[PDB]
Each structure stands twice: as C-alpha cells, then as structure tokens.
Design a protein around this ligand. Sequence first.
Ligand SMILES: CCOC(=O)Nc1cc(-c2ccc(C)c(NS(C)(=O)=O)c2)nn2c(C)nnc12
Length: 139
Amino acid sequence: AAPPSTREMVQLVDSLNRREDGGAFSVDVAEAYPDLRDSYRKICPRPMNLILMRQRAKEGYYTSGSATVYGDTVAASLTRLREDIELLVRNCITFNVKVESWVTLARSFQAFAHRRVDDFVLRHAAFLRGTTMGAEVYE
Ligand SMILES: CCOC(=O)Nc1cc(-c2ccc(C)c(NS(C)(=O)=O)c2)nn2c(C)nnc12
C-alpha cells in the first residue's frame, strides 16, 4: 500500500480552502492580530490553520516516519491530518462558543474536511472500502 505523495497531500490540503469560509481556517490569528496573541493563547493554546497544515503536507509530516498513513479503517487513516483538522475545528468552536452561526460554519467545515480526506484515502486505498469513515466518527 504505497502512501500518497507529498504533492497529492498538498493538493488535498489546498482542496480544504472553501470560498464560503473566507479564509477563516487559513488565517494565522497570531500573525494577523499581534495585539491579541495572549488572549488567543489562553483560549487556543495549540495553534492550527490551513497554512501550517499545507507546510506539514509538503514536508511529508502526514505521510512519513511514524505517521499513520493507512489504518484499519478510512476513519483511522491519515491520523495526523485528522488530528490537525480536529484541532482547527475545536479552536474555532471554543473561541466562537457564544456565536452559533460561526460554530455551525466550523461544524460544516469539519464534515466537509473529513469527507474530503475519506474520499482521498479511498482513491489511494481500495482495500479500506466500506470501513468506518471519518465523516461518521468526527463530530
Ligand atoms: C470583528 C468581526 O469578526 C468577525 O467578523 N468574525 C467572523 C466572521 C465570520 C463570517 C463572516 C462572513 C460570513 C459570510 C460568514 N459565514 S456564515 C453566514 O456561514 O456565518 C462568517 N466567520 N467567523 C468565524 C468562523 N470566526 N470568526 C468569524
């Protein structure tokens, strides 16, 4: 089972940018708002955004060394990318807990991103067809 190439992983992370999110999951809140860094660290002490995820994809961090590429199921495959997607969503829903519309946007992105990763895993690993999907597990 050959892992996906770094170019394919970069193309996968690039496909997670949606026009309807208007860069909400791409912006680096620390670089964009220097005068609010410390408040964002209190709420989201672990940083995550699609710029960091694209660097990780490009460098082989999701598909090299001890990264889990193919697991027992689609859901349990590309675990490092799934954890990064989950942190991105957790940070957004925690920060926006009082703004329901922006929580719903983060949940919409979560479902969308795990489905994009599920379909990508299936394109590279037909032997995982029919197993648990990340879109069924992550919520
Ligand atoms: C100081 C002003 O701050 C903000 O405007 N903040 C945020 C704004 C938006 C936002 C804007 C425009 C649109 C069209 C949407 N999409 S929708 C209708 O689905 O909600 C969302 N999202 N957002 C998210 C996530 N997290 N923070 C923000």
